[PDB]
Amino acid sequence: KRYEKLDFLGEGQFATVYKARDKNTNQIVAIKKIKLGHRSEAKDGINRTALREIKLLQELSHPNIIGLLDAFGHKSNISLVFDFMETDLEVIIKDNSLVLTPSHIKAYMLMTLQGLEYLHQHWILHRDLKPNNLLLDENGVLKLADFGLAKSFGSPNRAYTHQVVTRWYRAPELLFGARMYGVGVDMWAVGCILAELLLRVPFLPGDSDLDQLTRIFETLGTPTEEQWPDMCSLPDYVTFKSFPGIPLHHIFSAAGDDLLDLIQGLFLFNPCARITATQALKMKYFSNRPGPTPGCQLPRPPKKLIF
Amino acid sequence: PDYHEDIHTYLREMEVKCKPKVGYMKKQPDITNSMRAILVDWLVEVGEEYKLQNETLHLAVNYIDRFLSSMSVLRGKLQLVGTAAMLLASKFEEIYPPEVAEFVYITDDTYTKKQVLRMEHLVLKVLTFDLAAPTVNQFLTQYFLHQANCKVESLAMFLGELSLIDADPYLKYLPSVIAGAAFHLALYTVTGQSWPESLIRKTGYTLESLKPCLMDLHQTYLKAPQHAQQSIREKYKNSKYHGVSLLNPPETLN
Amino acid sequence: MYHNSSQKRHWTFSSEEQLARLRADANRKFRCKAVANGDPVFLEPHEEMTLCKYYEKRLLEFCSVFKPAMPRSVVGTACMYFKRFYLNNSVMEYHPRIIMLTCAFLACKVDEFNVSSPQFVGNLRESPLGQEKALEQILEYELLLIQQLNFHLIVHNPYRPFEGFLIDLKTRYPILENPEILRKTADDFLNRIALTDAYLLYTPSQIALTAILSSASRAGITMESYLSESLMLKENRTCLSQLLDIMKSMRNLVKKYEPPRSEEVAVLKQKLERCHSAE
Amino acid sequence: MENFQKVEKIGEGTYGVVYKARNKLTGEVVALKKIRLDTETEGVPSTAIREISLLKELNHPNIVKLLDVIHTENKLYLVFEFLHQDLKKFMDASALTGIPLPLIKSYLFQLLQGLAFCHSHRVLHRDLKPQNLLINTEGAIKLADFGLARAFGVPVRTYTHEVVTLWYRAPEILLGCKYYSTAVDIWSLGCIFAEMVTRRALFPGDSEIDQLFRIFRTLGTPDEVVWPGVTSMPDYKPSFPKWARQDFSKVVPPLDEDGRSLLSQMLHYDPNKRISAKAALAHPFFQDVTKP
Amino acid sequence: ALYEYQPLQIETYGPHVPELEMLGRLGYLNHVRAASPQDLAGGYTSSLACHRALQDAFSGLFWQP
Ligand SMILES: Nc1ncnc2c1ncn2[C@@H]1O[C@H](COP(=O)(O)OP(=O)(O)NP(=O)(O)O)[C@@H](O)[C@H]1O
Ligand SMILES: Nc1ncnc2c1ncn2[C@@H]1O[C@H](COP(=O)(O)OP(=O)(O)NP(=O)(O)O)[C@@H](O)[C@H]1O
Ligand SMILES: [Mg+2]
Ligand SMILES: [Mg+2]
């Protein structure tokens, strides 16, 4: 007598997501039921991704980060209760009915960057930033979600499993096999999400890691040792052809000068020199006219044979 | 491949078990052969629109023919049968099938998505999950290794697809026989050679055995411009298929 | 970070009186349940505390010789889990041995110390049949243990604050020529702190600073200037007074700790074994 | 569908849930894969459709038996023969001691027989990993998890998302090839054979580039002599490091000359030159195979 | 409505921690392990580790339950 399953939201390899009501305040919540997996993991205990999500979300509280309302579990199967999110950024990006005015893009970027700044102040990397991991509510508040890949950074000698985001939003340092990284991996994914918002299509849609690196170097130029001092030292580094790269304002013709500067800063090949969330929020682009859209005003998503 | 012979033999084993009941067409009280041809032409149009492989089209045609050999379907639901069979063939053959939304949008929403879903379930139940059926495309691919002329292969594919449109002469021939006849007809049309001896020793089909289906296919090729259904000819006029549908068919075939 | 952690908001208590109240409350609840089910077999709260101390020492020994070598954070997390669990529960309901094994398992999973289940159970000094039985028991008790922690799995240990304080001393305190000689003794003091209930009463930074200052006092070195000037506590004397008061309370807590007696542990273990078969 | 009594839940995967059940009317322990056809916006899943369709025609002693298929309005039940544990668990429990060589040879012989039956029936498994090979108590091993299986009567194109786990992935897939072939299954089976022999993965890579580099390190960087056409592969970069092939004695120590020769035939760079399943069945390695 | 940046104000209940970019200028980095070129390639600097250690050392030091 705690949760009344009223819908099926989605299905995935790690878990099944459905819709429920709290029966106390009749609140609408999204319950993620964690699967048992393969029989070979039946002696492993509770799923490690579920434990990671629980432990990380029980220590964070920001408006732009998904909240873990409850973590009740049957001893056979554990379930995680989140706020119900109406949609995500990917649906809005792929929806041609609605138009992404500059204020919409600025507001989405601002919510993402504020959530990321809160996340990075607590020494946590999201590591799975993509448009469908930026969920939206009926009030138009963007929240980072899917913390199964998230981990805490800052402490040295903590290299661990090689869990990385999908290659389209993977930073070049990760594509070269870097074990030790900082906020730059989230910053590159934020730049890729901004490029997707400006183009309505994936910026660098490679079909493999090598092709992803090829596209990155073809679009932004193969970096030298001036712009990336220790590029060759990464364990999975390979040499590439010296592509001149496309000038930024050709790719983004409608972008302004401040937006071009922000995009350049987010796509710097040097992870140390890449602009952080705090640096990006202090940029002139966000303080320029027009202002970001208020969350309430953000957009919400042949022949018959005659026989 | 050293298993290749086995595969061919295995194909010859299952083309018998996946053949539609001959003469099922007159046991249908509502639908006739002309509207079956119209349905196959519409399926060709759909395959062009969604850029599906020819194997998907052949599999869908086979599924439709097997379904109609055991169930009576009204003239209103024949197109739904075609859509569900095409969706099943896309699920079985394509890398990723189009969502059902596109399979109902192509029919200008004649049937809702739920109808497509239910008829797909019924087709699966009748076919008893026997969806890996040998087609003319597969046998033609098997035969093409004994050549290689791009135009010959394209025209053999064109004639094999033409064999799907008409059910009166072609339902009594197995996919292997039709593929052999089409390969001979393409070899005659382009390069002037005949049914290769290697193929006779491989498949056991001599010239006399192929002769009936061969003459039927020759007549079909001759009357292709006058045929009411022309989507295959428009499909093969593109430079992708090397423009062999607009070729000049032989007037005599010895 | 600790300052907005679940450990600070829910698992640091104002006094040892609250801890004693909670443990006696758990004992009373178990006694009421057992008598409602259907007298000298029940253990008093002090006997439960003695058994808890003995089994925490056993958990420390188990983690000390674990293969592969556990990071110290994992051992601290397991000990904190044991303390938190038996704060609100009775050892007469869940056996302390299996609960300590479950705490070690959960600490390994939470701290990203990737070890498989056969590895963990192979670290047991038991027959393979016993290893499988203990594995099944641990798997059964894992989610109950996660319940009794209120799903608060992140545990903040004093080791990183200790390292940060050492860095700050090496940088901004030239008076102390080399803080490195303060390490070992402070480490020893930290272990003594781990034996008491200070982890449930004070912050990790306070514990690490207390260890550092105790080690300095043992060596005849005083850093009143470090607290008054480097930490800028000369502007607010009240906070400095509370800080020294906290440190002196921690030192008294360490001094008053009494390790269990072997024969008393044997008698209490026999009583627990008898009681774990009478429910 | 009242004929089965659910005993327990074996496990749950991407789209279905597997129960261990008892046949009430006969007493046979079976596995029931329940796939809820409701909550599906596309119908019966393409993976389930392909799996059932291909598994109905694969009646082999070394392939999991699909006893029955139950189709219901909004769910689908698949009845499989029940096997107690898989190969992955078997070597996880046989660690520190090692699966015996006769058992290794028998298991490899049965796997190759099952794969030869699959390929002679124009079925491409594409998902050969130890977690997908189920053993029983009498010493049999059977191929399972035909979720990635495809029929290659026409060429099968490579798709990025549907692909085997990285450790058993062929280098042609890792260099961006366009069409699958029966060589990738042989590559995975050879990797599994080496893993059984050495109790660890042959190429435990973490990324695509890392997997390719481990392959290149163990077998030598490919030039056009060993793999004609490699330099024109879509993802082949000329500046790939030129590692040198190390002799197989330190790659698989316990294996003898026959086993090493067979394994090197299963690990040919060129998919065309890689040994086929039945040609592997006709190798001197299996002159003395007795199911133990 | 234009946007004006405001820094996050989270109370740490302890001594003020120096800014990340000023750690080298204040001599903190001389007592931490130097970042390897491999670490620097990925964006990991010893400054991050030093800042995290200092923040952990000063977190909650003045707090009483
Ligand atoms: N907080 C939420 N509120 C509502 N729906 C949610 C929420 N979180 C997830 N979902 C839904 O759950 C579905 C499952 O998707 P996801 O959680 O990404 O699984 P996945 O496919 O394994 N992940 P990925 O492989 O990274 O795309 C999504 O499609 C969402 O629609
Ligand atoms: N016939 C069988 N006998 C015993 N166990 C079985 C059988 N069939 C399936 N299983 C078990 O059922 C579990 C899940 O099956 P399945 O639905 O195929 O998941 P999977 O393919 O292993 N996982 P994924 O690829 O991640 O979706 C596995 O772990 C197998 O151990
Ligand atoms: Mg997601
Ligand atoms: Mg599977």
Side-chain angles (χ1 to χ4, degrees):
Chain A
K1 312 162 194 173
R2 182 52 193 275
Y3 281 116
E4 176 29 26
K5 203 190 59 131
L6 68 96
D7 200 7
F8 171 89
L9 264 181
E11 168 80 299
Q13 137 88 50
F14 271 137
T16 291
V17 173
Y18 51 98
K19 209 170 156 187
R21 248 192 154 100
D22 199 10
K23 282 177 184 176
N24 302 328
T25 168
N26 298 44
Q27 205 201 96
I28 181 46
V29 298
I31 304 199
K32 166 171 324 185
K33 193 190 221 241
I34 277 80
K35 298 169 167 189
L36 300 190
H38 192 283
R39 193 184 20 184
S40 44
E41 320 143 48
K43 285 327 190 311
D44 189 56
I46 308 198
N47 185 243
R48 266 168 221 261
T49 294
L51 278 182
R52 179 137 58 240
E53 248 268 358
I54 287 172
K55 89 195 184 201
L56 291 191
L57 280 192
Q58 282 281 60
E59 310 296 300
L60 309 167
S61 291
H62 191 266
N64 301 116
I65 291 183
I66 191 76
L68 174 67
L69 302 179
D70 192 295
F72 76 97
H74 312 78
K75 171 221 47 63
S76 64
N77 189 327
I78 190 176
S79 296
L80 314 185
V81 175
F82 302 87
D83 320 302
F84 172 65
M85 295 319 272
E86 152 171 333
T87 179
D88 51 25
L89 200 58
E90 186 144 320
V91 156
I92 296 205
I93 278 168
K94 291 182 170 316
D95 202 273
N96 324 330
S97 168
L98 43 91
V99 152
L100 285 189
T101 173
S103 304
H104 289 352
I105 301 168
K106 187 180 286 193
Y108 285 138
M109 279 303 309
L110 253 151
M111 269 154 270
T112 305
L113 277 183
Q114 281 166 331
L116 257 202
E117 194 199 23
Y118 180 90
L119 202 64
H120 294 163
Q121 260 194 236
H122 296 73
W123 300 89
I124 286 156
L125 301 174
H126 194 286
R127 300 201 301 160
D128 206 64
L129 283 173
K130 43 189 182 173
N132 54 17
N133 277 346
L134 309 182
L135 310 184
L136 267 299
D137 59 17
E138 65 271 46
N139 312 316
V141 172
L142 185 145
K143 297 186 199 288
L144 328 182
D146 273 25
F147 278 80
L149 290 206
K151 81 185 318 298
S152 76
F153 80 108
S155 177
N157 312 1
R158 286 205 307 188
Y160 297 137
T161 320
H162 53 270
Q163 303 292 332
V164 282
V165 67
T166 36
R167 74 178 50 97
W168 289 1
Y169 314 93
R170 201 172 302 159
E173 62 257 27
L174 291 176
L175 291 153
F176 275 154
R179 264 114 181 171
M180 275 294 228
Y181 41 90
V183 303
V185 301
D186 289 337
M187 287 345 284
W188 183 278
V190 159
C192 292
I193 282 164
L194 178 55
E196 208 153 315
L197 284 164
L198 271 37
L199 309 163
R200 305 304 287 273
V201 281
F203 189 34
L204 313 145
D207 42 89
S208 70
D209 295 354
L210 289 164
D211 186 50
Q212 186 71 27
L213 285 154
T214 311
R215 276 166 186 278
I216 290 178
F217 297 156
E218 276 180 328
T219 302
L220 309 162
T222 323
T224 67
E225 220 64 355
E226 278 119 326
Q227 328 151 273
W228 195 346
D230 296 342
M231 191 176 19
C232 311
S233 45
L234 289 164
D236 287 347
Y237 171 81
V238 317
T239 317
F240 262 79
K241 277 61 63 181
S242 178
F243 299 102
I246 323 189
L248 264 200
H249 60 84
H250 283 3
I251 315 158
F252 312 102
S253 54
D257 281 4
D258 55 352
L259 184 45
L260 277 175
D261 297 2
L262 169 73
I263 288 155
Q264 171 234 63
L266 282 171
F267 276 118
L268 282 178
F269 276 109
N270 194 3
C272 297
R274 191 172 310 146
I275 56 174
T276 75
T278 295
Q279 269 137 47
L281 283 173
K282 300 157 142 192
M283 218 86 158
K284 200 167 302 317
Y285 168 75
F286 294 105
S287 38
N288 271 339
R289 81 177 47 280
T293 305
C296 49
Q297 297 187 51
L298 283 173
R300 319 185 29 161
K303 180 175 81 264
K304 162 196 174 59
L305 315 167
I306 271 64
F307 283 157
Chain B
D2 85 335
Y3 53 76
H4 156 101
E5 187 210 340
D6 275 334
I7 293 191
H8 174 262
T9 287
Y10 183 68
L11 287 201
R12 290 279 303 271
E13 167 200 312
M14 324 271 315
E15 78 169 344
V16 179
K17 313 214 286 331
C18 288
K19 164 150 75 152
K21 268 194 232 174
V22 80
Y24 85 90
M25 204 34 204
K26 59 159 291 313
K27 310 154 73 94
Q28 293 276 351
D30 191 27
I31 46 96
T32 66
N33 273 320
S34 50
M35 77 204 45
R36 180 199 175 284
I38 303 208
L39 183 269
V40 180
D41 190 289
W42 175 69
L43 291 185
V44 170
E45 221 85 12
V46 174
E48 226 76 38
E49 256 308 281
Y50 295 119
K51 321 258 67 160
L52 308 179
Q53 318 265 312
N54 302 316
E55 185 69 10
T56 296
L57 169 73
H58 280 79
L59 284 168
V61 161
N62 163 255
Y63 301 158
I64 285 155
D65 272 38
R66 273 165 63 199
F67 185 72
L68 299 178
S69 60
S70 69
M71 319 264 309
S72 307
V73 152
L74 272 306
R75 73 182 73 211
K77 296 305 160 16
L78 178 57
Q79 171 154 19
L80 171 67
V81 172
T83 302
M86 197 72 177
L87 166 72
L88 277 172
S90 285
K91 286 206 194 182
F92 185 83
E93 191 57 41
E94 291 300 321
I95 295 208
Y96 58 79
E99 290 97 269
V100 186
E102 269 308 311
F103 272 107
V104 314
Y105 163 69
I106 176 59
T107 75
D108 59 64
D109 227 309
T110 300
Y111 320 92
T112 77
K113 168 182 161 197
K114 181 170 181 297
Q115 277 137 278
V116 172
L117 270 280
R118 260 278 290 99
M119 158 84 66
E120 176 220 66
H121 158 274
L122 172 80
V123 169
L124 266 158
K125 207 215 76 178
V126 152
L127 297 182
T128 284
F129 265 97
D130 308 296
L131 304 153
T135 60
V136 177
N137 219 273
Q138 295 180 43
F139 278 105
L140 273 181
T141 293
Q142 205 95 348
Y143 295 168
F144 285 169
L145 298 185
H146 299 3
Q147 252 179 299
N149 213 230
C150 71
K151 297 150 183 65
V152 156
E153 286 174 9
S154 286
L155 181 89
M157 292 273 132
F158 172 71
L159 293 170
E161 291 217 340
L162 287 184
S163 70
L164 303 171
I165 272 296
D166 294 347
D168 175 36
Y170 294 120
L171 259 169
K172 39 185 216 278
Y173 305 123
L174 293 168
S176 64
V177 165
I178 291 167
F183 187 60
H184 184 342
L185 197 43
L187 261 201
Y188 213 82
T189 284
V190 174
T191 79
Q193 333 177 255
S194 187
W195 184 238
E197 212 276 329
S198 51
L199 281 170
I200 331 175
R201 42 187 66 201
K202 170 197 187 42
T203 75
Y205 292 155
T206 87
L207 269 278
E208 194 271 18
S209 63
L210 306 183
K211 196 138 307 291
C213 183
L214 186 284
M215 289 321 213
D216 269 289
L217 249 196
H218 187 229
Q219 282 299 283
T220 293
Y221 192 18
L222 272 174
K223 313 208 207 46
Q226 289 86 246
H227 191 293
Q229 278 68 77
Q230 300 283 320
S231 304
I232 301 178
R233 315 204 50 223
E234 289 134 59
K235 169 179 164 231
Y236 281 78
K237 278 169 188 176
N238 307 32
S239 81
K240 153 101 184 64
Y241 306 104
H242 310 153
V244 316
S245 43
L246 45 83
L247 230 59
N248 191 324
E251 307 178 9
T252 198
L253 212 51
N254 290 356
Chain C
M1 298 273 93
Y2 179 81
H3 43 266
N4 52 5
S5 61
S6 64
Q7 165 169 342
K8 156 174 170 277
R9 285 180 293 107
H10 306 298
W11 297 100
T12 35
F13 306 93
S14 294
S15 55
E16 266 194 306
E17 282 69 60
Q18 267 156 282
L19 269 59
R21 269 201 296 251
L22 282 155
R23 260 174 289 223
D25 178 67
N27 198 242
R28 181 255 308 295
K29 285 173 156 83
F30 180 86
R31 292 175 104 129
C32 295
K33 174 159 325 193
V35 77
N37 181 334
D39 192 21
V41 78
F42 312 116
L43 275 71
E44 322 275 358
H46 70 290
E47 289 153 20
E48 269 193 23
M49 266 267 300
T50 304
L51 272 172
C52 277
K53 285 142 107 165
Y54 160 78
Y55 274 93
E56 186 150 24
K57 289 223 298 213
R58 287 266 326 250
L59 160 66
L60 274 144
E61 311 323 310
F62 171 83
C63 290
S64 83
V65 286
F66 198 92
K67 295 318 128 153
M70 245 169 237
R72 270 187 98 187
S73 85
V74 188
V75 182
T77 307
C79 298
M80 182 75 168
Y81 287 175
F82 195 86
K83 292 185 196 283
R84 280 187 192 172
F85 184 94
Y86 276 126
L87 191 72
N88 286 273
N89 279 267
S90 165
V91 312
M92 271 169 328
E93 187 162 359
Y94 315 106
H95 199 52
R97 151 68 94 89
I98 194 54
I99 283 321
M100 99 198 176
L101 289 175
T102 316
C103 286
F105 197 65
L106 190 52
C108 292
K109 298 240 263 187
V110 161
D111 283 298
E112 316 265 12
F113 181 46
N114 299 288
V115 295
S116 74
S117 303
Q119 208 129 31
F120 183 88
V121 298
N123 285 264
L124 274 162
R125 290 273 92 71
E126 207 29 74
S127 64
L129 225 40
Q131 292 183 352
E132 168 254 303
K133 166 161 238 265
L135 180 48
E136 205 67 288
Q137 290 190 288
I138 287 160
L139 291 204
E140 167 156 336
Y141 279 82
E142 161 153 7
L143 184 52
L144 155 78
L145 163 65
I146 304 186
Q147 283 178 25
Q148 296 311 303
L149 309 172
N150 283 28
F151 299 85
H152 297 143
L153 312 171
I154 287 298
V155 159
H156 296 281
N157 294 297
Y159 311 126
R160 197 164 331 126
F162 178 73
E163 301 291 330
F165 269 130
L166 275 204
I167 291 161
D168 198 54
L169 283 168
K170 286 164 168 191
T171 300
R172 291 191 310 159
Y173 212 53
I175 294 313
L176 191 49
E177 202 261 22
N178 180 29
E180 261 333 296
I181 38 68
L182 284 198
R183 180 171 283 282
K184 188 254 172 294
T185 290
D187 191 55
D188 194 284
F189 194 94
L190 269 194
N191 298 345
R192 298 241 289 170
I193 273 280
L195 285 211
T196 76
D197 294 308
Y199 278 9
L200 301 160
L201 300 174
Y202 302 89
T203 81
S205 54
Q206 282 156 16
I207 293 172
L209 189 50
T210 304
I212 287 191
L213 257 63
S214 301
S215 174
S217 289
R218 162 143 164 213
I221 310 199
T222 167
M223 302 106 78
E224 65 275 44
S225 46
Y226 176 63
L227 312 188
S228 66
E229 277 139 59
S230 290
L231 296 192
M232 263 305 121
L233 279 169
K234 65 189 204 332
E235 309 171 357
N236 180 19
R237 327 276 314 153
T238 62
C239 199
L240 178 74
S241 164
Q242 330 211 13
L243 200 48
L244 285 309
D245 220 281
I246 277 163
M247 275 174 279
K248 192 245 261 174
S249 301
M250 237 186 259
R251 275 190 298 272
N252 294 351
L253 207 86
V254 164
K255 110 167 299 193
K256 91 176 47 164
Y257 168 80
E258 259 286 31
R261 271 172 316 266
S262 79
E263 99 269 351
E264 225 270 298
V265 166
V267 187
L268 291 178
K269 166 145 29 161
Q270 168 176 358
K271 241 172 104 169
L272 213 61
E273 260 172 338
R274 276 156 31 213
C275 181
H276 259 284
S277 58
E279 181 230 31
Chain D
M1 62 76 180
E2 315 94 36
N3 197 32
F4 313 93
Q5 158 145 21
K6 321 241 177 140
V7 175
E8 41 152 356
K9 188 171 310 210
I10 294 171
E12 172 173 11
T14 316
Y15 63 114
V17 48
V18 180
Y19 300 99
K20 168 174 182 168
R22 157 153 289 81
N23 205 4
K24 305 205 217 158
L25 267 59
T26 307
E28 300 304 24
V29 182
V30 293
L32 268 59
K33 190 162 321 212
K34 180 187 131 189
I35 310 166
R36 270 161 136 289
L37 308 188
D38 204 0
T39 78
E40 234 70 48
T41 57
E42 314 303 333
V44 183
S46 298
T47 165
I49 277 169
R50 264 173 318 236
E51 186 184 46
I52 302 155
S53 309
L54 298 177
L55 263 169
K56 282 184 73 55
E57 331 197 305
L58 295 178
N59 179 230
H60 201 267
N62 296 116
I63 298 170
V64 287
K65 184 90 192 62
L66 179 57
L67 303 155
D68 198 329
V69 184
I70 306 172
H71 212 179
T72 280
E73 177 188 349
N74 272 301
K75 42 191 36 181
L76 169 84
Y77 292 69
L78 318 182
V79 190
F80 299 98
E81 60 174 317
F82 175 79
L83 291 96
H84 72 311
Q85 70 185 312
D86 51 350
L87 187 66
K88 159 82 156 298
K89 196 135 190 243
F90 188 51
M91 340 188 266
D92 264 346
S94 163
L96 184 137
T97 171
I99 308 181
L101 190 300
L103 195 49
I104 287 314
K105 184 173 308 188
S106 167
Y107 282 177
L108 179 64
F109 198 63
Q110 293 175 69
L111 293 171
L112 280 162
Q113 270 180 313
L115 205 59
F117 189 86
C118 289
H119 290 174
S120 56
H121 283 39
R122 52 106 184 75
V123 178
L124 223 60
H125 190 286
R126 299 209 287 117
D127 201 9
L128 285 187
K129 65 166 99 150
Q131 308 99 279
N132 287 347
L133 312 176
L134 303 170
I135 68 200
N136 63 359
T137 40
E138 315 89 306
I141 185 160
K142 320 202 188 193
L143 312 170
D145 196 13
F146 282 73
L148 283 193
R150 291 265 193 175
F152 60 96
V154 294
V156 176
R157 312 169 137 61
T158 48
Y159 179 43
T160 70
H161 305 113
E162 72 184 52
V163 75
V164 84
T165 41
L166 190 80
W167 291 0
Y168 317 91
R169 183 108 43 105
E172 51 264 34
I173 323 164
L174 294 164
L175 278 163
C177 77
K178 302 63 46 193
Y179 296 107
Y180 273 105
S181 95
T182 50
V184 304
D185 281 335
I186 287 306
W187 179 277
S188 305
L189 252 197
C191 292
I192 285 174
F193 177 34
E195 173 165 12
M196 289 197 275
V197 169
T198 50
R199 268 111 44 80
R200 71 167 179 292
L202 191 50
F203 313 116
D206 326 303
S207 44
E208 286 153 50
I209 295 155
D210 195 47
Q211 182 71 7
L212 194 78
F213 275 177
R214 299 224 205 199
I215 294 184
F216 288 179
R217 209 180 325 258
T218 318
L219 306 173
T221 292
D223 192 2
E224 286 261 329
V225 162
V226 290
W227 181 355
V230 66
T231 53
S232 299
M233 296 255 138
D235 296 344
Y236 182 87
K237 308 283 160 47
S239 268
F240 277 159
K242 314 297 280 184
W243 287 288
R245 146 176 300 255
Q246 53 219 13
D247 173 309
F248 260 23
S249 295
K250 46 221 190 282
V251 174
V252 280
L255 260 175
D256 300 15
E257 195 307 323
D258 286 294
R260 272 187 297 261
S261 54
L262 183 48
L263 181 55
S264 94
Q265 310 206 252
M266 328 200 51
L267 298 176
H268 213 288
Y269 263 127
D270 195 352
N272 284 322
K273 299 328 180 75
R274 210 168 293 153
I275 187 160
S276 78
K278 47 192 265 183
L281 281 174
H283 204 263
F285 180 56
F286 302 106
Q287 273 147 0
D288 51 292
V289 55
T290 282
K291 176 175 166 181
Chain E
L2 311 196
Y3 169 76
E4 154 95 16
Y5 170 67
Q6 310 285 342
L8 265 192
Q9 292 192 353
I10 303 161
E11 178 61 71
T12 63
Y13 305 116
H16 156 90
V17 177
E19 328 83 284
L20 174 60
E21 71 274 350
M22 302 253 300
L23 288 189
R25 189 180 290 140
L26 296 179
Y28 286 100
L29 305 191
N30 288 108
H31 313 108
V32 303
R33 200 186 72 269
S36 320
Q38 224 200 12
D39 296 337
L40 275 175
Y44 190 83
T45 70
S46 60
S47 280
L48 300 175
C50 180
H51 209 222
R52 174 133 206 231
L54 282 171
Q55 287 185 222
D56 275 288
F58 292 168
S59 192
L61 185 64
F62 304 155
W63 191 72
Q64 240 168 15

